[PDB]
C-alpha cells in the first residue's frame, strides 16, 4: 500500500529533524558552564526504534526518548568558581564536537533521502489515478 508510505516517511522526517535538533543543541552548548539548576549541560541523544505495532516487522522510525550521555563530564580545575566541588573541580559538557558535526551532516542527508522518497511516492500515486484514462 502506497498510502502507508506517507506515514512511514513522515515519521522518518520527524525523527531525523529531532536528531538534527539535538545535534544543534549539543553543538551550541559545547562550552556551557551551568544550567538554570546549576547542573552542567549533559549531551543529549535521541533513541530511534521502529513502530510496527499491528503485526509487522517494518513500520518506520520513531524517537522513544531523549537521554543524557553517561560518558564522563570533563573536569576542569577552577577553585574560584562557585560551582566548583570540594577539590575545586568544575564539570563541563561531554559533547563530542566532531561527532555532532557528522551527526548534523548525516541527519541532513537521510532527511533529504526521505524527502525524495516522499516525492517519488506522491508522483506514483498521482499517476495511479489515471489508470485507464
Amino acid at each position: 500500500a502506497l498510502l502507508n508510505i506517507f506515514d512511514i516517511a513522515g515519521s522518518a522526517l520527524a525523527a531525523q529533524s529531532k536528531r538534527l535538533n539535538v545535534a544543534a543543541s549539543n553543538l551550541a552548548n559545547a562550552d556551557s558552564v551551568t544550567g538554570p539548576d546549576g547542573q552542567p549541560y549533559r549531551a543529549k541523544q535521541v533513541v530511534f526504534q521502529v513502530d510496527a505495532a499491528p503485526g509487522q516487522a517494518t513500520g518506520g522510525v520513531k524517537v522513544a526518548s531523549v537521554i543524557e550521555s553517561q560518558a564522563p563530564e570533563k573536569l576542569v580545575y577552577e577553585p574560584g568558581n562557585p560551582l566548583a566541588d570540594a577539590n575545586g573541580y568544575v564539570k563541563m559538557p561531554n559533547v563530542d564536537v566532531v561527532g555532532e558535526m557528522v551527526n548534523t551532516m548525516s541527519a541532513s542527508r537521510s532527511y533529504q533521502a526521505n524527502i525524495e522518497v516522499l516525492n517519488t511516492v506522491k508522483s506514483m500515486m498521482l499517476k495511479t489515478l489515471t489508470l485507464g484514462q
Binding site: 563530542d96 566532531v98 561527532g99 557528522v102 548525516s106 542527508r109 533529504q112 516525492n119 517519488t120 508522483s123
Partner: protein, 250 residues
C-alpha cells in the same frame, strides 16, 4: 548514509583524544617526579557478514614512560631522588599504599613527613619526625634527626624510607596520579611490595619530568595531518551521498 563517514569521524575524534593526552603531558613538563603517559592508536575490526572492510580506530594509553627523568641539584637535605626503577611509598588518598617518584619531602608542624600532602611510608608505617628538627636522609633511606640546640653529637637514626622496585609493566597510574600495582603483578608479588635493600637514593637532588619534547612535537604534527586527512575523507563521503540521493527521484 555510507558508514564510511563513521570511520573517519572516529579517527578524527580519537586524534583529538591523543592531542588532549599529549597536551596534558606538555603541561606537566615541570612537575617534579612526573611520568609521561604513552598514547597509541589501536585498530579494531568490525566482525560480521559479509566482506570485512571496516576497521575502526581507538586511542589507548599503554601505561606510562618509566625512563628516569632529569635531576636538578637543589641544596636541600629533604629533596631526594631515586635510583632508576625505584619508587617511594606513600599513603594514598583512601588510606591505601601508593608509589611515587616525587622526592619533595615536607615536614609539618607536628613532625610528620609528607609528599604532595600524602603521608610518607617507612618500614614502621607513616614516619613521624621529632618536632622542628633538622633531617638528613642517607643513601639507603635512613633518616637522621638533629634537635636544634643540642650538639651535633645527638644525631641518631629515626626511621627508614620504604623504597620499592617496580618496572613499567607492573604498575598502573591511578586516577589521582599515584601508581599502584596491576592485578596480574599484585597477584604474584603480593598486596604490599617488600622494600628492596639494593635501592639507593641521592639527597639534595630533585627528579623532574621525563616529557620528551621532540616526540611531543612530532606527535602534534602527525595528529594535525591525520585529522585533516580524516576531514577530507568525511567531505568526500558526504559529497558522494548527496548525489547518490538523486536515484530516488521520479
Amino acid at each position: 548514509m555510507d558508514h564510511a563517514i563513521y570511520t573517519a569521524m572516529g579517527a578524527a575524534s580519537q586524534t583529538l583524544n591523543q592531542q588532549a593526552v599529549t597536551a596534558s603531558n606538555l603541561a606537566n613538563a615541570s612537575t617534579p617526579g612526573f611520568r609521561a603517559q604513552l598514547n597509541a592508536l589501536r585498530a579494531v575490526p568490525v566482525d560480521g557478514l559479509s566482506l570485512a572492510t571496516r576497521t575502526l580506530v581507538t586511542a589507548s594509553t599503554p601505561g606510562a614512560d618509566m625512563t628516569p627523568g632529569q635531576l636538578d641539584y637543589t641544596s636541600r637535605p629533604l629533596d631526594v631522588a631515586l635510583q632508576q626503577d625505584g619508587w617511594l611509598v606513600v599513603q594514598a588518598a583512601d588510606g591505601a599504599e601508593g608509589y611515587t617518584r616525587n622526592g619533595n619531602i615536607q615536614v609539618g608542624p607536628t613532625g610528620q613527613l609528607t609528599i604532595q600532602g600524602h603521608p610518607v611510608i617507612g618500614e614502621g608505617g607513616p614516619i613521624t619526625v621529632p618536632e622542628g628538627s633538622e633531617i638528613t636522609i642517607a643513601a639507603d633511606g635512613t633518616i637522621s634527626a638533629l634537635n636544634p640546640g643540642d650538639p651535633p653529637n645527638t644525631v641518631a637514626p629515626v626511621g627508614r624510607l620504604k623504597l620499592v622496585k617496580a618496572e613499567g609493566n607492573e604498575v598502573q597510574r591511578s586516577d589521582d596520579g599515584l601508581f599502584r600495582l596491576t592485578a596480574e603483578a599484585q597477584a604474584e608479588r603480593g598486596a604490599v611490595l617488600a622494600a628492596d635493600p639494593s635501592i639507593r637514593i641521592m639527597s639534595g637532588v630533585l627528579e623532574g619530568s621525563n616529557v620528551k619534547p621532540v616526540e611531543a612535537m612530532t606527535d602534534m604534527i602527525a595528529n594535525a595531518r591525520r585529522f585533516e586527512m580524516q576531514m577530507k575523507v568525511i567531505t568526500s563521503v558526504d559529497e558522494n551521498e548527496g548525489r547518490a540521493n538523486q536515484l530516488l527521484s521520479m
